[PDB]
From a paper:
In addition, we reveal that the N-DRC is associated with a network of coiled-coil proteins that most likely mediates N-DRC regulatory activity. We localized CFAP337 and CFAP57 and showed their interactions with the CCDC96/113 complex. We also find that the CCDC96/113 complex is in close contact with the DRC9/10 in the linker region. Our model implicates CCDC96 has crosstalk with the N-DRC. Therefore, the CCDC96/113 complex may function as a signal transfer bridge for the N-DRC that runs from radial spoke RS3 to DRC10 and vice versa. Our model revealed that the N-DRC is connected to an extensive network of coiled-coil proteins on the DMT that span the 96-nm repeating unit. We hypothesized that the N-DRC conformation change during ciliary bending can be transmitted to the coiled-coil network by pulling force. N-DRC stretching can pull on the highly elastic coiled-coil protein network.
The N-DRC is a large 1.5-MDa, ~50-nm-long Y-shaped complex with two main regions: the base plate and linker regions. The N-DRC bridges neighboring DMTs and restricts sliding motions between DMTs.
Residue numbers in the entry:
A (entry chain I), B (entry chain i): 1 to 185
C (entry chain L): 407 to 457
D (entry chain D): 54 to 105
E (entry chain L): 1 to 305
F (entry chain B): 52 to 102
G (entry chain E): 1 to 104
H (entry chain L): 509 to 862
Write the structure that this text describes.
Amino acid sequence: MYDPNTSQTEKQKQEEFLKLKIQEAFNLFVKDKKGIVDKREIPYIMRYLGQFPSEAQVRDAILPEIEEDEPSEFIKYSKFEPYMLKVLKEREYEPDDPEALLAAFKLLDQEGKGYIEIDMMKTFLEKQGIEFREQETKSFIEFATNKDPNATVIYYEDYISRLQAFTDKHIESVMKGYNNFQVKK
Amino acid sequence: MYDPNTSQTEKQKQEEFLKLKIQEAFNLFVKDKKGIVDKREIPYIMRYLGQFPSEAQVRDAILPEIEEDEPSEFIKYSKFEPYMLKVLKEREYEPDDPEALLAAFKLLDQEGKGYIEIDMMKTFLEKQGIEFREQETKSFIEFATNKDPNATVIYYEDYISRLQAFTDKHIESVMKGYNNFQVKK
Amino acid sequence: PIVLKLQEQIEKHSGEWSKRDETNNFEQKHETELAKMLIKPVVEEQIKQQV
Amino acid sequence: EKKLLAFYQQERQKINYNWIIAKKELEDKKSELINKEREIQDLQENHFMTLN
Amino acid sequence: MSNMMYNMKWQEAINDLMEQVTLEYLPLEQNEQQLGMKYKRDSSEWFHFWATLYIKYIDIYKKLEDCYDQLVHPQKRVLLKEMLENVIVRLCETKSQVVKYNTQYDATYKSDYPNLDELVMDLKLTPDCLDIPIPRYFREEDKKRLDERNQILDALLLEYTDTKEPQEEQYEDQNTLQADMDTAIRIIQRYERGRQGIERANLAKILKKEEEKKLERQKKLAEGTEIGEETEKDDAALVIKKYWRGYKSRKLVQDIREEELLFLGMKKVVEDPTLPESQYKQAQNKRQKMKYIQEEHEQEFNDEI
Amino acid sequence: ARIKDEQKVVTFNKKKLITYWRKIMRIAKTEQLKNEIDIYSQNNQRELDSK
Amino acid sequence: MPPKKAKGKKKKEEEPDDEYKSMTGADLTQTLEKLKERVNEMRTNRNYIQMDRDMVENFYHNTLKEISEVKTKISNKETEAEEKESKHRIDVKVFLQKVKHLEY
Amino acid sequence: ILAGLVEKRVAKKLIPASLMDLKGEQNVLGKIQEIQADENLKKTEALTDAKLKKAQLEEPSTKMPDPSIAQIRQIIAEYIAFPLGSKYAKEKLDKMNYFFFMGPRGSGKTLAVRALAHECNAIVLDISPSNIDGQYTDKKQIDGMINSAFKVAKEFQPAIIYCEDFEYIFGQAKKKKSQVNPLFAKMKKPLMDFKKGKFFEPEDRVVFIGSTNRPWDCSQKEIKSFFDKKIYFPFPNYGTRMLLFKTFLEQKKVPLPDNFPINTIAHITEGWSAGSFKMAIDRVFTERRLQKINEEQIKLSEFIGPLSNVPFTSKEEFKEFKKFNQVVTGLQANYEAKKAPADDQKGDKNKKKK
């Protein structure tokens, strides 16, 4: 998304591009009142830009950070955009290393079968770590098995490949037009 | 193919291009006599170059202008070279933009299933517009369904993507032989 | 010395086989006549040792 | 692209000399083949003469 | 075509051996004739002669070793082994001579890596001809001693490590992260939560696009635009037809290219070596039978002796 | 972006060469098959004379 | 453990001062036309050489195939000759035995 | 002795392999490369600037065309297998019973050793640190280890002794605190003792090879004085990289696209040894990736990441390889023998007797 190693003008241009994409993501869940969205949409607007905060990290920092002195169910985009731009510039919540996920899935597949049982993955996600909702677990299983109802073991290598492709496509969609991106005076 | 956005030398180059591509496709389509190929192969010959003529188009404009004064069943290459030269220069029958097919298949699938049943595709391309013959319709359905004989529907989006890719590949092959001709002294 | 040994063994092969008819030995079996020439000295040596 | 051209030209020269080797071997095999047909015909004539 | 070709090829190998011996002697003959004076036989000429002799002796070694391995006559085979070892020694001597005379570029590099590219090109030989293959008779000869040695080694392997196979140098991948099982679980959890947040944002955007498009359609309909729908499917089919004609012509062209690839030569065909009918596997059964024949023939020769 | 006067638009020389050498090699291979007409005719006539 | 790649100060390349620093727009148009078709004179040399080399390799494959076929048919012919010579030997033996049938 | 070596992993059988496993094209332009190197040396010999001339002469002669894989295989065959597999060849050929292998990991040192052992029917005696680490903690224990390995090698003809990573036994004490046990560097003394004793007879079908991934860490003088001949497995060139890439692609049976940039991937892999090259190829093409190969074409970017992730050898290591090879093989001595001027005489050297 953002390139923090550019010149002054390029840094400003990418900061403005990040601000525009932050506004896009925020409007994605702006439902009733313009400029403010439900703080629960904050993680999803966060991920739209290529940043993957966990639910715990969100609730602990991102929610109060963009929340006013008095915590509010909705977080104004006025406060949301600066923190979003900072995070995009710093790559704070950018997706973890593909190699890191490969190692994690190798660990989960302790037997090195090249695949991990979907039942075991469900147990891990719903009883270990930040327990996913059943919807989150089902979505992960679907994306890992390529929406295979008969699937019972997830081949983590191609699951990571699919996740890489999807994230790359989404990031390209968010970052597109930057080459033709013009900064107003 | 032909790019009318060049100088005089490049314009002559592209004129001789259209000429030489006519020559080469005709040579590939010739049975006995040099410089003359059947009018029926004219759609095939120029689709070998990158044209997408309607059958009515070939019957009505391509053939009458390329034919001589008296009714003849063969075309002189010396005559089709000028006509096909102008045709490629004006890009009259170049394959239109792929979202054309996208919208075509979307309109055909009136029920919005994300796919068109094989029967519906057969009806659309046999009773609507120019009529595919049995072979044309069957091969169309096969390639659109990815050679799945058992499929009761045609994945029109997949067919569109594959058709666009194949069109680009063959057009690149055609332009391989598009460009050089130097002014001969 | 290698070249000399090669020449000597080539002369051996020539004098042993170049005039030998290989038409009847289709499958390339060991020649019994060459076997006899290789074998006679063993018996000669045994008799010499006993005497 | 220049390096590509150099590599492909080297491969072409190698496989041209391979043409030469393979074709000469084929000609030798064909000459042996003809000699062997002649051998069989002569053997047939000899066997028939012996039978007679 | 096995035995007669073997005999003729051995005869040709012997003839080439005489040719190389004569090529060695000829410098000797010239030296004896005209060393009343002194030859300006430069180290360059000497090195060229020795490189030619070395290549010739590599070829002679290869041919003679193959003949010794395959030719089924044991009386022939023993002497062929002897003369093959002789050719080995002579080839190494020629290599040493080439090392000695490697004074090209006015420098005395006596290395063992001679670049024979120019000589091979001059003599019309393949670059692969410079490759020296290791003998099989190294394992073959005195195999009974080697057989006992390897059998004892395998017995030791089985009794000690339970595995007689060669050990593998462990490619310890550097991409093994030292993270906990819960660490991996939560890393995957963050991945999936980010993916699901992206999906939720995309779904909200798609829904909003849905209301926007519905509103635009309603406004257009209220604008009194009489949008015909009959010709929509007809033109859809016609465009599909033009595209399909293009694709069918393209597939015809690509199949023409493939057929040129096969017949006219534009493509190699990757044959399956594992196929017994594959020329290689058929001729492999050929050598299997013929080598069992060679074994039985050596047995018969020993029994006859 | 330099693609139309000494960089990119020289497809013809060796693509029109592709087609022209297709013509040439078609002529040469047809001539080779015609020469094999006489070659295989001599072989067949010899076999019939042999037969 | 993952050795995170350092956020080194990016290139900010001080654009080399080559011969690419001494022309104007019209001189561009000219140098355009001076390198615009030809550099793929060269790429097309590569493509035509690829065509030629593929043809060459397939014809070499054909020649090796013919060599193997002629070898195999020579083998079959030699087997036929050997078996028929065995037939001749057996016939000669049978006639030298027919010097027994005639005796009887 | 053989059973004990096997138990300690000393005496073993190496995987069936051939020297041709070293994938590297014949030096098609070897003479041209040598001509250009000689021309460059001549050009550098005529410089007027003293410091520039000194700097140019100080670096190892990288201008030398690195030995082709075919040349490496030819030398290995002639100088080992003929001495190794053929007793008459060993008796009548160069009587050299020790060789030094230089080259990067996966460049073909261990592969060539295994190929030699297998193709000559030679049982291997890996006394390398990677094989003996954590097993021996006494100098007398190492003495017995070396004695038993050499005895097994001599007895079971053919037999070879392998010391991979040769730089760790003949190291320098002047260096800092080395991670490898100095007890392992201690094997240098028994090696010299045995060599000076001449246990390997000229007719014996045994040879000791010190294969080092860090020949520069090896001793130039000691490698000169210990191993009769030096074999260096240089990194794949343009042609060698093409050969390795095609060989691994065919080994994995991945279909090759018509317009695929095989040479482009070779260039992007430029500087990658054979082992790292194959590791990167396998990482790019996994089992499920292999299955999807019929679905997904091979892409150049598929190696951008895996290539940068697989171990890569620094051009500094390249130059160190070249320098150590040139020095140890006596190449530097031969180079210096011809550049020494004879103008200096044998004059006054007596006045300064105090």
